[PDB]
């Protein structure tokens, strides 16, 4: 777990995608997914609906966020669709006057540690959630509200680690949650904000390595209420401070030589730990699942027709789909299938009769050659 050696010195509505893991066949078991992403703050209520009522047993992934600090979650459950059943996803968020309902329509390597602290004045201590990733696969989690109060495994290949690993990781993620709790009280005072408001502090930490496994880039950055706070620059020698409050943190961390400590850890322990994980999970992390591609042609009228280019079951999540006009293409965000693979599609409305003139360009590292269909 990352070190975090020193203490300190907005609203986005969720994007909702409801879909099945595999193509829906009546009477065949499947998985109903609701992927919410690109929202801030983190608190969100997501429900899966079937024939006008809530599906009682629904699981969800651990809270994480993208590079732009926006959160994403996957709500999922097993189901068997029939001809009569109608399914939808209901999402409640501070950005919505009422819950929104969406109906169901039938290489290099990196390690990251993400953390989110959400204050809840009057309702006790802030909620701290931390997750760890290798490429696009999560392997550890910690929830300060959980009964275990331990770093928990979230990937099969991390269960190999002995008790000394889990003792060390739990104590370090616990110390981080206390540091970020004190940081929340510091940011409250520096910005002269009321004590009755809820605030969010996010942190990101990790390293990049190339194909040879040697160090490439290192990262350590903070976000407060969805806005950049402080960030370690690319040279791992100085900081980027967003506002005057963060400039106080920058000068404090400069005198303590925090950048020198983070640079040594990023180029050392982070790379050594990422190299170990890539080996133990070789059959998982060092695999390349190529996309299962297919195209659909269904007209929306007699004037126009819609062509959708599908890509299914690929890993990692990086992919590129193109038909070149970028203003006439609908491009959904890459979504997880729930089994470790990812999905994406590209659509374009097209004058009827000119279907055989359009082609889809598929780019993925799991393909020896980029496909054209």
């Amino acid at each position, epitope marked *: 777990y990352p070190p975090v050696p020193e203490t300190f010195g907005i609203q986005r509505t969720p994007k909702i995608q409801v879909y099945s893991r595999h193509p829906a066949e009546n009477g065949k078991s499947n998985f109903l997914n609701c992927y919410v992403s690109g929202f801030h703050p983190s608190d969100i*209520e997501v429900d899966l*609906l079937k*024939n*006008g*009522e*809530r599906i*009682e047993k629904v699981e969800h992934s651990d809270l994480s966020f993208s590079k732009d600090w926006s959160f994403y979650l996957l709500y999922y459950t097993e189901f068997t669709p029939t001809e009569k059943d*109608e*399914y*939808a996803c209901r999402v*409640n*968020h*501070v*950005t*919505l*006057s*009422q*819950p929104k*309902i969406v*109906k169901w329509d039938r290489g290099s390597h990196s390690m990251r540690y993400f953390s989110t602290s959400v204050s809840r004045p009057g309702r006790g201590e802030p909620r701290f959630i931390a997750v760890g990733y290798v490429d696009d696969t999560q392997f550890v989690r910690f929830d300060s509200d959980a009964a275990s109060q331990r770093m928990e495994p979230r990937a099969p290949w991390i269960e190999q680690e002995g008790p000394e690993y889990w003792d060390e990781e739990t104590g370090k993620v616990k110390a981080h949650s206390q540091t970020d709790r004190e940081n929340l009280r510091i940011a409250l005072r520096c910005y002269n904000q009321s004590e009755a408001g809820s605030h969010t502090l996010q942190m990101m930490f990790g390293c990049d390595v190339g194909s040879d496994g040697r160090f490439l880039r290192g990262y350590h950055q903070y976000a407060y209420d969805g806005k950049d706070y402080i960030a370690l620059k690319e040279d791992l020698r100085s900081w980027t401070a967003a506002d005057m409050c963060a400039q106080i943190t920058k000068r404090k961390w400069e005198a303590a030589h925090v950048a020198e400590q983070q640079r040594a850890y990023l180029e050392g322990t982070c790379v050594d730990g990422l190299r170990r994980y890539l080996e133990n999970g070789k059959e998982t992390l060092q695999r390349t699942d190529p996309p299962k591609t297919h195209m659909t042609h269904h007209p929306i009228s007699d004037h126009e027709a819609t062509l959708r280019c599908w890509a299914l079951g690929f890993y990692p999540a990086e992919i590129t789909l193109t038909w070149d006009q970028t203003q006439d293409t609908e491009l959904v965000e890459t979504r997880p299938a729930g089994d470790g693979t990812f999905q994406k599609w590209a659509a374009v409305v097209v004058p009827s009769g000119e279907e055989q003139r359009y082609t889809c360009h598929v780019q993925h590292e799991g393909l020896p050659k980029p496909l054209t269909l």
Partner: nanobody
Amino acid sequence: EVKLVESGGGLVQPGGSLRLSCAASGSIFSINTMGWYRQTPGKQRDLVADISSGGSTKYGDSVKGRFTISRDNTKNTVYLQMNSLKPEDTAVYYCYGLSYSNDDYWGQGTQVTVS
């Protein structure tokens, strides 16, 4: 299509109790889930309690054990028994229903005030 008639509410002191009711007008088997959301001081509304035609219910965490929801399917009417009311329970409570095709309907709301 579907009309939701709300009634109840009022003005009460802390520790007091209040009732709510909401009836659905239209087709007999037109509505599945019925319940209440309440307006936060901000923009969003939070779930208070709802119940399906089969009796499955869910409560918001802040009202569990204090509020109790019931339903009469023969009249398409739900009832909300609120006890141990607190000032933070003061809000406009919107009744809502869900069609079997997952279409939502909303009442105009009913005011509840606790000192």
